Amino acid sequence: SMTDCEFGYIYRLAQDYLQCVLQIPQPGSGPSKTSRVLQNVAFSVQKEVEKNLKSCLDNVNVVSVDTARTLFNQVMEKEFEDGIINWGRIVTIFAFEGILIKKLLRQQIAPDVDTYKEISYFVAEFIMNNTGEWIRQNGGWENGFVKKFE
């Protein structure tokens, strides 16, 4: 279905973002235009969040991928509980993924990056489930999100 094309595309974007964060080269050309555009603006947003929440985030400790999931779902539920979805807020989901990875590789004395793969799963799930409706209806990624932040 058209649902399946959307969900693999979103998974690809979340996997791309994770590898950008961890400075890993993914194969082929490099990343798609849409992925590169997302990576640049999500990073912009992420650093803006990190400086606005310095005092705050120093108290946050993400121990494992399971505690990262608990926090991700709680934070995304509280972010969209006012029912408003716009592209900027969609970017913030990625931006927050990035923060969860940084906190998780910070504390892990043995950082196992096989299992960090699971982060991109739960991120893609949240986007596909909560905001995927909105995305198809608002131009997609290719003409919706690109035309806005390229």
Partner: peptide
């Protein structure tokens, strides 16, 4: 705090772009 920041900033960047 975290929810606030993502909302504010996320909404701001939507405005800006």
């Amino acid at each position: 705090x975290i929810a606030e920041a993502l909302r504010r900033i996320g909404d701001a960047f939507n405005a800006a772009y």
